[PDB]
Design a binder for these strands. Structure first.
Ligand code: XG4
Ligand code: MG
Ligand code: MG
Length: 430
DNA sequence: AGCGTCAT
DNA sequence: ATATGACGCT
């Protein structure tokens, strides 16, 4: 109808770095560039656990969450770089810093929401209308979109990938209505021109390549980004949604990869996101509750209102280490020594944070997991964080958990601890 | 406040 | 065989 909202009011992009930790190591070590390559943590455990994989190594089937020794069976020439270890744990300082390089450049173009160490959303609505003016009324050249895919195109009456790409892009452009400054597709198109520039800026100034999605909301931008990785960007228009969603498994939409998505599948008897359109909102609200119901009713139509939040910094600063199986911490002396390792790294990072971003954390959260409980957090207690001091912070963290020790013995800890997690939260401006 | 979900 | 971050529910 004429009163029904189509969710075309915003231009939103998600930019995600291609195999980010590997790129960071490849920039540093030229010997690793353009090779099957992976980043692991903890060498002595089956060669280390893989957390990032180059696309050359992906083509042998190497994946995240693989042990390196297993990965070598698939890929014997697989090169590896290992994560820095400090105080007996993984230290991610180099990637956090690399992330700041990327985030800052993105910030010159628009207000961003940092979504992970590697990706950010971008509300390009204002930048689009500003460019749209000063473009007078000139058409948009395909030269301006040299890595952009139009989802759903080409269609209708080349055998190579770049061949298909341009044909899709030509079809799209040749249909475009530059007469109308207020057309959503035009908005998206100009949004995509800006992301080309932004992505060019990131690579020119950091050496890092990335992919992006351009659409009208965060969920479509995120999904779009993944459609043509690596080193490419994808425009998912409102019109492209019904065909796209008609074979799109539900688990692929953001926040639907867990238990909620499974229950949508199980309770409703469906597989694809598009199948959700045949249910009334009240029906959906009835099954998955009021909030999820509303969200699903609109999302299966390509409509989502979640705003890009202005927030380039993390809201919490955290430290954890798992103590699996037999390395579980079973003495009081062990627990105190590790809380101190954690407290020391956290102090280092909080002091940095205070000087960089003019703020202080005020609350400390202590998380632990106990042997046998598969709940990845068994218990969570908190205290005041009044000083950036490792010894006090570990002493406090111990105070608030020490009563979990069921061991009648003075010097023993039971049940043995399989995770320690320290988290600084509740920031105030300093 | 403490716990559960989803995710990179 | 084996590290963090955002946010929702009660
Ligand atoms: N320590 C740790 N780091 C992780 C884990 N999972 C991901 N990371 C880190 C390592 C990742 O590099 C980084 C970004 O996560 P993605 O974007 O989902 N994977 P990438 O960027 O490598 O490839 P592409 O995006 O092109 O598919 O987060 C984990 O379980 N543990
Ligand atoms: Mg990435
Ligand atoms: Mg990412």
């Amino acid at each position: 109808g004429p009163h029904m909202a189509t969710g075309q009011d915003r231009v939103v992009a998600l930019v995600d770095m291609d195999c980010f930790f590997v790129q960071v190591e490849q920039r540093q070590n030229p010997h690793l560039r353009n090779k099957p390559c992976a980043v692991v943590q903890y060498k002595s455990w089956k060669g280390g656990g893989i957390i990032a994989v180059s696309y050359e190594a992906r083509a042998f089937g190497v994946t995240r969450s693989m042990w390196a020794d297993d990965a070598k069976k698939l890929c014997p020439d697989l090169l590896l770089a290992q994560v820095r270890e400090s105080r007996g744990k993984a230290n991610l300082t180099k990637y956090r810093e690399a992330s700041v390089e990327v985030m800052e450049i993105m910030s010159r173009f628009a207000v961003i929401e940092r979504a992970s160490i590697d990706e950010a959303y971008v509300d390009l609505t204002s930048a689009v209308q500003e460019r749209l003016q000063k473009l007078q009324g000139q058409p948009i050249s395909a030269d301006l979109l040299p890595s952009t895919y139009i989802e759903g195109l080409p269609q209708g009456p080349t055998v190579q990938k770049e061949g298909m790409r341009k044909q899709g892009l030509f079809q799209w452009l040749d249909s475009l209505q530059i007469d109308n400054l207020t057309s959503p597709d035009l908005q998206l198109t100009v949004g995509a021109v800006i992301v080309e520039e932004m992505r060019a800026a990131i690579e020119r100034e950091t050496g890092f390549q990335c992919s992006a999605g351009i659409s009208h909301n965060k969920v479509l931008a995120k999904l779009a980004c993944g459609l043509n990785k690596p080193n490419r960007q994808t425009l998912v228009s409102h019109g492209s949604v019904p065909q796209l969603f008609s074979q799109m498994p539900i688990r692929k939409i953001r926040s639907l990869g867990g238990k909620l998505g499974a229950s949508v599948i199980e309770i409703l008897g469906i597989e694809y996101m598009g199948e959700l359109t045949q249910f009334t909102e009240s029906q959906l609200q009835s099954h998955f509750g009021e909030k999820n119901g509303s969200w699903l009713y609109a999302m299966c139509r390509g409509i989502e209102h979640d705003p890009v939040k202005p927030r380039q910094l993390p809201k919490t600063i955290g430290c954890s280490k798992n103590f699996p199986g037999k390395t579980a911490l079973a003495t009081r002396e062990q627990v105190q020594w590790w809380l101190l390792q954690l407290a020391q790294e956290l102090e280092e990072r909080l002091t940095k944070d205070r000087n960089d971003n003019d703020r202080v954390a005020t609350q400390l959260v202590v998380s632990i997991r106990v042997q046998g409980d598969k709940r990845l957090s068994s218990l969570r207690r908190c205290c005041a964080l009044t000083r950036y001091d490792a010894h006090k912070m570990s002493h406090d963290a111990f105070t608030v958990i020490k009563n979990c020790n069921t061991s009648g013995i003075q010097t023993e800890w039971s049940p043995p601890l399989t995770m320690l997690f320290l988290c600084a939260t509740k920031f105030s401006a300093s």
